[PDB]
């Protein structure tokens, strides 16, 4: 069978939703990994970035 056991559509924003969960730490720019401020200038990549 065709590889289409899933199908997807776009929508109008009939309603908003909750924003993405607050990060109290630093936000890794590309990844947005929330990381602790003690893990900056650490000498290690904690972001994947």
């Amino acid at each position: 069978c065709n590889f289409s056991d899933k199908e997807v559509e776009d929508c109008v924003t009939n309603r908003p939703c909750r924003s993405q969960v607050r990060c109290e730490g630093f936000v890794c720019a590309q990844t947005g990994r929330c990381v602790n401020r003690r893990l900056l200038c650490n000498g290690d990549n904690d972001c994947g970035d």
Binding site: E24, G25, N36
Partner: protein
Amino acid sequence: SYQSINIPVTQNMVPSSRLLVYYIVTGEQTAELVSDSVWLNIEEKCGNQLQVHLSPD
């Protein structure tokens, strides 16, 4: 912006008095107590302010 300390300097303060301010912030997961203090001179006015005078000046 935080409310200022709008207060009357009440009569019990008239001897030079002191103020301290603080908050605890929970941090990422670790709390810290943050605080500061200041001296406040309150001009030595009595409560009674008893005024006594020779009327036949």
